[PDB]
């Protein structure tokens, strides 16, 4: 986006002042939309020395004579040319600027406009800056942040020592990664993205996207009237064990609820019988095992069952022991179908196998599984989109790194999902998503498309739960999937 | 307003490009508000060589990539610097410009943006310009005019040979006189006034205003609970004749309906009895006359009746003959109370008398009465605000020049009224307004304030009529006045 601004100025010829003007008025309009008539409110605008502060001077100036009171506290020690120009305008228009922040000053104002730091933030916030940000956070005033809440790293969403907690953030051109990833997503509050005049061709040249309702609607496969189950594909799910008998059921119904024609589970006997006692629409094939876990002795039977399907999902509730490891890796090495690899199949995966496979794969780890897979700490991998990209590219796969914001990448294109809620923070919810992904692949979507549609729908079904989110379970989530699909059109 | 732009640039330091940018985006936002989502529509933007055209290039550029289609037809033969800059931007952004207007081109577009001429119009429109404007008017497309519909003189509202008939006009800073006076008021369609960043102090320094609901609400006198009729003043109306027996009644009730405490009519006997048979709340004093008209023999009795009132209204239905002339002029020369002078009292008025009077006056002519009063043609005086100003100043009066847009001036401040409808185009309606004005003077408003509140309320009562406007009569208007007052708060 910094390249976007500079191309818009230097190559398209839009004066940098025009961009800054448009940015500032966008903030005023956004605030009006959110607060109603502005004329009753008193505004305290906190301006740094950079262009974020310059946008703040534009805000301040456009509120003069229209609101109850405006005051700018200028917190920097030199001004960029556009900030300087706009400071000069604010003052020529009769605006008051002070350079000392007084704790009690919060008292005489209703709204704080946070134009201290935007994308130009570098390093931890300390000193007076930190104190002022902590004072604003303690104040209980309405806070509107310009571009990004000051203290959020716009590339990662990390907090740099301290950051502003905004009620409303107005950003320009496109959402920034730091609005999308936590903690920054939380500090952003309500996000509005304003068009400030960049050419549409530049705005669309960005390669990292938020998954939106319109994108998912255009990816939903068709349902031609003259169809039959085979039109909508076939999934095999290899899942479960004597310890984990529920996982297969949740994955299986996940595929059926998104419209797959046929779903077959391969589960150790007698645990396979659990699935059809719940949902008799499922086929649950009994696998004879020595000790209740898949092993190499089941390899041939599973490959055989794979012949008649379009996609295989593997991993939920398999357990993680050496015989599962041998089986999973030899299976995936020979399977010549797209594979969705989850849970214990990731825990025992040899990544060399992904490089050997001619057929596609999707991997669906949470950060603990991703950490073990690449031999790093959870903290190293969580919300680490660049590592996810690198991984997907090196291993020729789609990687779906699950968290409150889920990252979906094939190494070239990266998408972020922001649907869902804490009801999904409960065992079983990942198992459902695995079935959803396999299902959409079976229906004809690419691995990346299937993953994109599934993470969105999965999170949106969670939001449709009627009662408090914390009581959502996977079985209820299943019931909500078709309502999510209906609402998506 | 041209001075306003130039002070904002040269003295406040706002770049002229910033103003032009803000103007153009205002037009886009206004259109969205009016048409809904723009993305379905195809836009034909007609741009002249001046800054109106420059605003059009901004519009065109901001629609690129967002709407179905945009085309600019550039109709000038040189470009002002800001128009040139914005033309360059439109082209750098990928916009298409043509210089030949093809009649059939209207076919492929839904909306015409009219940015040909704004306030820079000078002289009659001819040639290709006229042809293009006539083609647009015949087209039945949606027309949005930038600043003023091209062809309207923004100072007078006159049409310069031909002009654009707009569905929506977006003007900047303040309404222009040519939006307010006919024919221009009609060609403007729906008017939005956009804030494009002028300092509020300059916008408020304008001395000609549209009368608004808020202004009338703040002028309405108070009704303290501990009051009696004398709190709310006393009016004498000198009116009527054997020919015109209804006028007194309509004026009298006009004063009572706006909240005056007491109203006395002096009307020739037996016509005075007509008033109380309709409205027994009125006092209608019988005046003995020789032939059914006021004359000098009634002078002493009328001055006597004037002693106990706060304001005298004179003129409705007096008739116009020499004895009325003698009486009216000698009366007004001796009356030491504010006077509201209407109808036949204006027809026989010697304007020297207004210069002699120490007490204030309001004159309420329609253009035919104003024409006779100053010895000019109706066409010379209609909508002639500067002549009205000059007259009020020279004669130390308030002049209320009635028409669909009514002008109210004391020579220093001029206000325009835009309430009302053609139901008021019917005898009796002027008589009611006369009573309203006298009433508000009696309640303590200045002549100018009373006139301002009355013209607004009078027109707004007409708009509250439940059935078709053409069947509105003065008696129904009377009934609506208190509803207009209630709605005004």
């Amino acid at each position: 986006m910094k390249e976007i601004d500079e191309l818009t100025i230097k190559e398209y010829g839009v004066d940098s002042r025009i961009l800054m003007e448009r940015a500032g008025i966008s903030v005023v309009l956004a605030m009006e939309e959110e607060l109603g008539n502005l004329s009753d409110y008193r505004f305290l605008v906190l301006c740094g020395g950079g262009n974020n502060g310059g946008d703040g001077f534009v805000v301040a100036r456009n509120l003069l004579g229209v609101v109850k009171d405006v005051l700018v506290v200028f917190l920097g020690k030199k001004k960029t040319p556009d900030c300087e120009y706009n400071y000069g305008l604010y003052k020529k228009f009769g605006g008051k600027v002070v350079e000392q922040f007084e704790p009690s000053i919060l008292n005489e104002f209703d709204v704080v406009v946070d134009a201290i730091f935007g994308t130009g933030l570098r390093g931890e916030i300390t000193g007076e800056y930190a104190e002022i940000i902590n004072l604003v956070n303690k104040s209980g005033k309405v806070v509107v942040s310009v571009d990004v809440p000051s203290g959020i790293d716009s590339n990662t969403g990390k907090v740099l020592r301290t950051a502003v907690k905004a009620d409303l953030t107005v950003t320009f051109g496109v959402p920034k990664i730091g609005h999308i990833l936590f903690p920054g997503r939380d500090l952003t509050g309500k996000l509005k993205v304003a068009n400030i005049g960049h050419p549409v061709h530049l705005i669309n040249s960005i390669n990292r996207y938020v998954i939106t309702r319109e994108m998912v609607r255009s990816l939903l496969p068709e349902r031609p009237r003259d169809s039959h189950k085979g039109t909508y594909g076939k999934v095999l799910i290899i899942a479960g064990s004597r310890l984990y008998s529920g996982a297969p059921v949740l994955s299986g119904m996940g595929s059926l609820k998104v419209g797959t024609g046929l779903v077959k589970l391969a589960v150790p006997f007698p645990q396979n019988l659990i699935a059809t006692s719940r949902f008799p629409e499922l086929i649950s094939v009994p696998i004879d095992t020595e000790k209740g876990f898949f092993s190499l002795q089941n390899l041939q039977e599973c490959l055989e069952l794979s012949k008649d399907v379009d996609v295989v999902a593997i991993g939920p509730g398999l357990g993680n022991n050496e015989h599962v490891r041998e089986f999973v890796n030899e299976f995936l090495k020979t399977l010549e179908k797209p594979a969705v690899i989850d849970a214990d199949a990731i825990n025992v995966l040899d990544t060399s196998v992904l490089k050997e496979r001619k057929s596609p794969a999707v991997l669906t780890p949470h950060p603990g599984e991703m950490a073990r897979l690449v031999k790093k700490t959870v903290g190293d991998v969580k919300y680490n989109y660049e590592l996810a990209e690198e991984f997907a590219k090196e291993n020729d796969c789609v990687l779906v790194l699950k968290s409150a914001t889920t990252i979906v990448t094939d190494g070239e294109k990266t998408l972020f999902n922001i649907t869902g809620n804490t009801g999904l923070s409960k065992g079983g919810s990942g198992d459902v998503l695995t079935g959803m992904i396999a299902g959409f692949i079976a229906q004809g979507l690419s691995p990346l498309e299937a993953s994109t549609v599934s993470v969105y729908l999965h999170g949106f079904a969670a939001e449709l739960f009627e009662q408090d989110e914390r009581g959502l379970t996977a079985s209820e989530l299943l019931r909500l999937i078709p309502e999510a699909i209906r609402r998506l059109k | 307003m041209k001075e306003i732009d130039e002070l904002t640039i040269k003295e406040y330091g706002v770049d002229s490009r910033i103003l032009m940018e803000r103007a153009g985006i205002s037009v886009v936002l206004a259109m969205e508000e009016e048409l809904g989502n723009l993305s379905d529509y195809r836009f034909l933007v007609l741009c002249g060589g001046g800054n109106n055209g420059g605003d059009g290039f901004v519009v065109a550029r901001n629609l690129l990539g967002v709407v179905k289609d945009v085309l600019v037809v550039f109709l000038g033969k040189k470009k002002t610097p800001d128009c040139e800059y914005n033309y360059g931007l439109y082209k750098k952004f990928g916009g298409k410009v043509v210089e030949q207007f093809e009649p059939s081109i209207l076919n492929e577009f839904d909306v015409v943006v009219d940015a040909i001429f704004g306030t820079g119009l000078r002289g009659e429109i001819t040639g290709e310009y006229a042809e293009i404007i006539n083609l647009v008017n015949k087209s039945g497309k949606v027309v949005v005019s930038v600043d003023v519909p091209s062809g309207i003189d923004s100072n007078t509202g006159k049409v310069l040979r031909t002009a654009v008939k707009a569905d929506l006009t977006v003007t900047f800073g303040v309404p222009k006189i040519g939006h307010i006076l006919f024919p221009g008021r009609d060609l403007t369609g729906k008017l939005k006034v956009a804030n494009i960043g002028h300092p509020v102090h300059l916008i408020n320094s304008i001395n000609r205003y549209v009368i608004t609901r808020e202004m009338v609400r703040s002028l309405l006198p108070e009704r303290p609970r501990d009051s009696h009729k004398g709190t709310y003043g006393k009016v004498l109306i000198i009116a009527g004749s054997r020919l015109y027996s209804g006028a007194p009644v309509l004026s009298g009730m006009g004063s009572l309906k706006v909240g005056t405490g007491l109203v006395k009519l002096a009307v020739p006997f037996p016509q005075n009895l007509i008033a109380t048979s309709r409205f027994p709340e009125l006092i209608s004093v019988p005046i003995d006359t020789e032939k059914g008209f006021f004359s000098l023999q009634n002078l002493q009795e009328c001055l006597e009746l004037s002693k106990d009132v706060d304001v005298v209204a004179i003129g409705p239905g007096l008739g116009n003959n020499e004895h009325v002339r003698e009486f009216v002029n000698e009366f007004l020369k001796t009356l030491e109370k504010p006077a509201v002078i209407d109808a036949d009292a204006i027809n026989v008025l010697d304007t020297s008398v207004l210069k002699e009077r120490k007490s204030p006056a309001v004159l309420t002519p329609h253009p035919g009465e104003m024409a006779r009063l100053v010895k000019k043609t109706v066409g010379d005086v209609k909508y002639n605000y500067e002549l009205a100003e000059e007259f009020a100043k020279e004669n130390d009066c308030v002049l209320v020049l009635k028409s669909a847009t009514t002008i109210v001036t004391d020579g220093e401040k001029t206000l325009f009224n835009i309430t009302g409808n053609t139901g008021l185009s019917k005898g009796g309606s002027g008589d009611v307004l006369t009573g309203m004005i006298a009433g508000f003077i009696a309640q303590g408003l200045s002549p100018l304030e009373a006139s301002t509140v009355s013209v607004y309320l009078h027109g707004f009562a007409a708009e509250l009529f439940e059935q078709d406007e053409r069947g509105l009569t003065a008696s129904e208007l009377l009934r609506l006045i208190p509803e207009a007052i209630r709605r005004l708060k």
Partner: peptide, 7 residues
Amino acid sequence: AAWLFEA
């Protein structure tokens, strides 16, 4: 409603 437009 009124920062940008007067009706």
